[PDB]
Amino acid sequence: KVVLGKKGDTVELTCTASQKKSIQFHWKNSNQIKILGNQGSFLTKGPSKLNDRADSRRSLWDQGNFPLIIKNLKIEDSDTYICEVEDQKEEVQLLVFGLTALTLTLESPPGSSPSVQCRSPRGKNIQGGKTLWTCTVLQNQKKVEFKIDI
Amino acid sequence: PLFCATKDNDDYQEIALNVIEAFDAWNNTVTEQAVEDVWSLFETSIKPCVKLTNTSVITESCDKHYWDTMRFRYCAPPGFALLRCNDTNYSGFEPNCSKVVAATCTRMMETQTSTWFGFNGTRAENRTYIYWHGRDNRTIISLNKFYNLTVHCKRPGRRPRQAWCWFKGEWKEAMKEVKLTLAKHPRYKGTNDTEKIRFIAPGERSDPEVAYMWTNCRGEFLYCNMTWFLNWVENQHNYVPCHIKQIINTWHKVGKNVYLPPREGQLTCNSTVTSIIANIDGGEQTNITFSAEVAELYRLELGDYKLIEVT
Ligand SMILES: *[C@@H]1O[C@H](CO)[C@@H](O[C@@H]2O[C@H](CO)[C@@H](O[C@@H]3O[C@H](CO)[C@@H](O)[C@H](O)[C@@H]3O)[C@H](O)[C@H]2NC(C)=O)[C@H](O)[C@H]1NC(C)=O
Ligand SMILES: *[C@@H]1O[C@H](CO)[C@@H](O[C@@H]2O[C@H](CO)[C@@H](O)[C@H](O)[C@H]2NC(C)=O)[C@H](O)[C@H]1NC(C)=O
Ligand SMILES: *[C@@H]1O[C@H](CO)[C@@H](O)[C@H](O)[C@H]1NC(C)=O
Ligand SMILES: *[C@@H]1O[C@H](CO)[C@@H](O)[C@H](O)[C@H]1NC(C)=O
Ligand SMILES: *[C@@H]1O[C@H](CO)[C@@H](O)[C@H](O)[C@H]1NC(C)=O
Ligand SMILES: *[C@@H]1O[C@H](CO)[C@@H](O)[C@H](O)[C@H]1NC(C)=O
Numbered sequence: 001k002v003v004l005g006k007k008g009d010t011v012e013l014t015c016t017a018s019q020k021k022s023i024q025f026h027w028k029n030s031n032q033i034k035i036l037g038n039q040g041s042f043l044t045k046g047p048s049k050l051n052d053r054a055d056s057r058r059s060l061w062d063q064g065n066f067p068l069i070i071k072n073l074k075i076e077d078s079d080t081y082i083c084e085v086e087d088q089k090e091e092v093q094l095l096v097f098g099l100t101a102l103t104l105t106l107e108s109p110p111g112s113s114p115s116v117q118c119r120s121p122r123g124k125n126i127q128g129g130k131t132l133w134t135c136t137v138l139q140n141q142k143k144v145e146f147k148i149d150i
Numbered sequence: 151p152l153f154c155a156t157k158d159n160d161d162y163q164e165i166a167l168n169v170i171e172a173f174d175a176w177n178n179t180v181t182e183q184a185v186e187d188v189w190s191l192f193e194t195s196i197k198p199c200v201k202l203t204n205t206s207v208i209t210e211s212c213d214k215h216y217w218d219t220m221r222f223r224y225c226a227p228p229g230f231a232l233l234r235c236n237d238t239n240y241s242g243f244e245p246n247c248s249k250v251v252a253a254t255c256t257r258m259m260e261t262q263t264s265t266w267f268g269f270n271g272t273r274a275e276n277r278t279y280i281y282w283h284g285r286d287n288r289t290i291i292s293l294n295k296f297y298n299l300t301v302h303c304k305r306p307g308r309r310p311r312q313a314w315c316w317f318k319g320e321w322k323e324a325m326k327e328v329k330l331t332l333a334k335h336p337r338y339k340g341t342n343d344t345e346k347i348r349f350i351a352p353g354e355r356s357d358p359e360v361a362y363m364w365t366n367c368r369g370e371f372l373y374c375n376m377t378w379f380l381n382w383v384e385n386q387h388n389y390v391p392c393h394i395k396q397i398i399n400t401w402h403k404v405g406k407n408v409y410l411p412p413r414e415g416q417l418t419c420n421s422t423v424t425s426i427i428a429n430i431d432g433g434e435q436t437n438i439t440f441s442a443e444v445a446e447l448y449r450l451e452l453g454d455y456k457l458i459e460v461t
């Protein structure tokens with residue numbers, strides 16, 4: 001699974017589990033450093049950079065859903081995040097980029113080399129790389145659309 | 151549904167049975183009911199004025215009564231019976247316990263609620279042993295009563311919401327014993343043995359009850375800062391400052407309870423420390439971080455039981 005979000009937006013990284021007995025979920029990153037998890041109805045938060053921005057809908061814990069919510073994204077918040085309950089573990093890759101402004105620039109995570117492509121309402125494709133109506137950046141299957149003004 | 155006798159006590163001797171049974175501290179209807187019942191006792195012992203749930207605000211009659219009757223005992227419902235793993239090698243999970251015994255009712259269970267440490271437990275013996283989850287590395291650690299471990303907290307007496315707690319006892323060597331018995335437990339798991347095995351607090355950005363050590367004294371919820379107690383026993387004091395709160399987060403359900411302001415007098419409690427609640431992250435180095443899982447207290451108290459049906 002991959003999710004991609006716009007810098008300064010929130011994303012809800014989903015994680016779900018089918019156990020009737022009461023369990024402890026964990027979220028961590030590629031480095032195996034913990035961002036958050038539960039202990040009963042309490043929320044526990046590891047020493048990661050995310051904290052402040054990292055949270056979960058606790059009201060959904062009782063029925064299996066253990067989401068990781070990051071608010072106000074930052075390019076370096078891009079990572080492969082892992083939700084573990086016990087022995088199972090879902091992964092979710094997050095990749096976040098925004099558009100500065102016209103020479104347009106696309107700051108992305110290091111590792112990802114994306115391409116922005118902008119198309120006007122009746123005028124057509126201006127496709128590039130990092131530097132350059134609706135601007136779409138491409139990575140994996142989907143992209144994320146943007147904006148322009150005259 | 152197990153009948154929950156109050157207080158009984160201790161005329162409930164047991165008998166050896168020539169059988170093999172599977173035991174589990176977590177997947178277990180005795181401990182699963184214990185947790186619910188303790189949660190129910192939690193809301194009646196210290197009475198909340200308001201309860202905030204996402205959707206609603208529940209206001210009820212509160213005051214400053216405090217039920218100190220913290221011990222109870224289960225007995226089997228009709229057509230069922232209690233078995234127990236009387237093997238000393240039990241570590242909260244065993245599919246082939248051959249030392250099975252049977253009783254009419256369970257041992258005494260301590261109903262107190264706390265994080266990091268369990269207090270006034272039954273199940274204190276002359277050994278440190280470790281209940282360890284079947285799946286997962288959730289654990290509750292019994293401490294050895296050889297080392298005369300207590301906690302002793304007071305609020306004078308001056309400032310209405312401040313308090314200290316002294317950790318009396320041979321903690322120096324009780325704590326290295328738990329480190330050492332983890333090192334030769336059937337899940338070491340990646341470990342060097344001592345020195346490069348350490349106790350760790352959860353993040354401060356965690357809930358108050360996780361970040362601080364939650365407990366109560368004379369019906370007042372204290373929250374203490376454990377950094378001095380952690381500096382002592384790793385690297386600096388055998389006491390800690392704790393501060394009282396009225397808004398607290400509920401351990402079992404998602405919500406907040408608001409309580410009345412503290413008592414006027416000198417508060418003081420004498421408590422025997424009997425368990426560490428923790429999670430073991432084994433390093434191939436390892437860290438044992440303290441937990442606020444709470445329900446696991448009751449899994450130490452009754453996790454060696456099993457309710458079987460007689461058809
Ligand atoms: C662990 O066990 C001890 C012993 O039962 C608990 O402390 C005892 O419990 C309450 C307060 O927590 C005290 O009872 C009250 O005493 C005052 C007079 O000081 C009186 O006004 C009340 O009517 C009531 O009798 C009791 O003094 C206290 N005793 C000792 C020796 O500490 C303790 O609270 C337990 N710890 C936990 C964390 O549950
Ligand atoms: C319990 O902790 C251990 C750590 O000792 C974990 O089990 C494996 O540990 C080795 C190295 O010690 C790693 O290479 C494996 O990846 C770990 N296995 C996993 C994550 O399944 C393990 O994290 C914990 N046990 C469970 C059931 O989660
Ligand atoms: C339970 O085991 C202990 C020691 O392991 C023993 O002393 C005791 O007599 C046993 N009781 C029964 C009923 O088997
Ligand atoms: C839970 O315990 C019961 C009885 O010991 C058993 O039938 C079941 O397989 C156990 N595990 C789960 C996951 O339900
Ligand atoms: C009691 O505990 C201590 C500390 O672990 C141990 O050294 C001693 O041998 C034990 N004594 C008995 C009688 O079991
Ligand atoms: C154990 O600690 C308690 C509480 O401080 C104390 O009263 C007692 O004298 C200590 N020693 C023994 C042997 O019980």
Ligand SMILES: *[C@@H]1O[C@H](CO)[C@@H](O)[C@H](O)[C@H]1NC(C)=O
Pocket residue numbers: 353354361362375376377
């Ligand atoms: C405990 O005190 C330390 C030492 O200054 C402090 O850094 C920390 O914020 C306190 N703990 C918590 C959970 O706030």
